[PDB]
Amino acid sequence: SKPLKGFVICCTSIDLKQRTEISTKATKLGAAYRSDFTKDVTHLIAGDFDTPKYKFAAKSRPDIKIMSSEWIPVLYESWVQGEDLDDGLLVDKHLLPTLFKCRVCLTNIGQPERSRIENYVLKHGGTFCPDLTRDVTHLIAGTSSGRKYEYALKWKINVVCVEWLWQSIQRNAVLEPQYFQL
Amino acid sequence: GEVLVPETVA
Amino acid sequence: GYGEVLVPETVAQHRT
């Protein structure tokens, strides 16, 4: 009976069908559902990191949990089937992977730090890209030179130092690239 | 509540 | 359909 009383949920980059399912089920669970990102939002369900709502939460609101689209349907399913819930309300099991929708490429980084970066990208839900293509989201560069670097500038792909990755992992959110320039 | 970021325009 | 441009992974790698 109203397990999500006091929760205020908002979506970013969630398709209409899934957004309608989430708002309907979250409302039945007792939550408030907000189309705008209001000051009282507690949980942001995100389908991408490259949005103004996501950027605001990553920069200014670490208290707000960034959740996977599957959170509300999975919690609703347990609740409507009469299963016991706990005070965690499955939140920690459905946090959005930090590097969700990231496609990360590397350039000018030696071993073993190059393969360690690749492992961390995969561990945190990103896609690792050995080759640079126009759909890469971040190029982590050891130096500002070379073929991948020049093509990332041409394709307007973010070029960041590895500190972007480390700070994004510890912040549990993709951070903006202008703070991690070479 | 106070709007921090508006809804994405469809 | 059309070919894609790829910048290949660096072949010659170095140990830091």
From Swiss-Prot, chain A:
Entry keyword annotation includes Repeat: yes
Q: Which GO terms describe its cellular component?
A: chromatin; cytosol; DNA replication preinitiation complex; mitotic spindle; mitotic spindle pole body; nucleus; site of double-strand break
Keywords, sorted A to Z? DNA replication, Nucleus, Phosphoprotein, Repeat
**Subcellular location, principal:** nucleus
| Domain (BRCT): residue spans on this chain | 1-89, 93-182
Disulfide bridges in this chain? none
UniProt GO molecular function:
signaling adaptor activity
Q: Subcellular location, in the record's words?
A: Nucleus
GO biological processes = DNA replication initiation; mitotic DNA damage checkpoint signaling; mitotic DNA replication checkpoint signaling; mitotic G2 DNA damage checkpoint signaling
Domain of life of the organism encoding this protein: Eukaryota
Subunit structure as annotated in this protein's UniProt entry:
Interacts with drc1/sld2. Interacts (via BRCT1,2 domains) with crb2; a single rad4 molecule interacts simultaneously with both 'Thr-187' phosphorylation sites in a crb2 dimer.
What biological function has been recorded for the protein in this entry?
Answer: Essential component for DNA replication and also the checkpoint control system which couples S and M phases. May directly or indirectly interact with chromatin proteins to form the complex required for the initiation and/or progression of DNA synthesis. Interacts simultaneously with both 'Thr-187' phosphorylation sites in a crb2 dimer for establishing the DNA checkpoint.
From the Swiss-Prot or TrEMBL record, give the protein name.
S-M checkpoint control protein rad4
Q: Please tell me the species this chain comes from.
A: Schizosaccharomyces pombe (strain 972 / ATCC 24843) (Fission yeast)
UniProtKB/Swiss-Prot annotation, chain B:
Q: Report the leader peptide range.
A: none
Task: Tell me the compartments it is located in.
Answer: Nucleus
Give all Phosphothreonine modified positions.
T8
Q: What happens when the gene is disrupted?
A: Not resistant to the microtubule depolymerizing drug thiabendazole (TBZ). DNA damage sensitive in response to ionizing radiation (IR), ultraviolet (UV), hydroxyurea (HU) and camptothecin (CPT).
Q: Write out the domain note.
A: The Tudor-like region mediates binding to H4K20me2.
Function, please?
Answer: Essential for cell cycle arrest at the G1 and G2 stages following DNA damage by X-, and UV-irradiation, or inactivation of DNA ligase. Plays a role in the response to DNA damage. Interaction with rad4 via its phosphorylation sites in the N-terminus couples the DNA checkpoint apparatus to chromatin via interaction of its C-terminal BRCT domains with epigenetic modifications on histones H4 and H2A, respectively, in the G1/S phase of the cell cycle, and facilitates recruitment of the checkpoint kinase chk1.
This protein's assembly is summarised as: Homodimer. Dimerization is mediated via the BRCT domain. Interacts (via BRCT domain) with rad3. Interacts with rad4 (via BRCT1,2 domains); a single rad4 molecule interacts simultaneously with both Thr-8 phosphorylation sites in a crb2 dimer. Interacts (via Tudor domain) with histone H4K20me2. Interacts (via BRCT dmain) with histone H2AS128ph (gamma-H2A). Interacts with chk1. Interacts with sad1.
Q: What is this protein called?
A: DNA repair protein crb2
Species annotation: Schizosaccharomyces pombe (strain 972 / ATCC 24843)
Name of encoding gene: crb2
Swiss-Prot record, chain C:
User: Any idea which residues bear Phosphothreonine here?
Assistant: T10
Effect after changing T10A: Abolishes formation of radiation-induced crb2 foci at DSB sites. Severely impairs checkpoint response after DNA damage
Subcellular localization, as worded in the UniProt entry: Nucleus
Q: What happens when the gene is disrupted?
A: Not resistant to the microtubule depolymerizing drug thiabendazole (TBZ). DNA damage sensitive in response to ionizing radiation (IR), ultraviolet (UV), hydroxyurea (HU) and camptothecin (CPT).
Bridged cysteine pairs (disulfide): none
Q: What is known of its domains?
A: The Tudor-like region mediates binding to H4K20me2.
State its role. Answer: Essential for cell cycle arrest at the G1 and G2 stages following DNA damage by X-, and UV-irradiation, or inactivation of DNA ligase. Plays a role in the response to DNA damage. Interaction with rad4 via its phosphorylation sites in the N-terminus couples the DNA checkpoint apparatus to chromatin via interaction of its C-terminal BRCT domains with epigenetic modifications on histones H4 and H2A, respectively, in the G1/S phase of the cell cycle, and facilitates recruitment of the checkpoint kinase chk1.
What is said about its interaction partners and assembly? Answer: Homodimer. Dimerization is mediated via the BRCT domain. Interacts (via BRCT domain) with rad3. Interacts with rad4 (via BRCT1,2 domains); a single rad4 molecule interacts simultaneously with both Thr-10 phosphorylation sites in a crb2 dimer. Interacts (via Tudor domain) with histone H4K20me2. Interacts (via BRCT dmain) with histone H2AS128ph (gamma-H2A). Interacts with chk1. Interacts with sad1.
Protein name according to UniProt: DNA repair protein crb2
Annotated source species: Schizosaccharomyces pombe (strain 972 / ATCC 24843)
Taxonomic classification: Eukaryota, Fungi, Dikarya, Ascomycota, Taphrinomycotina
* Full protein segment contained here: 180 to 193 of 778
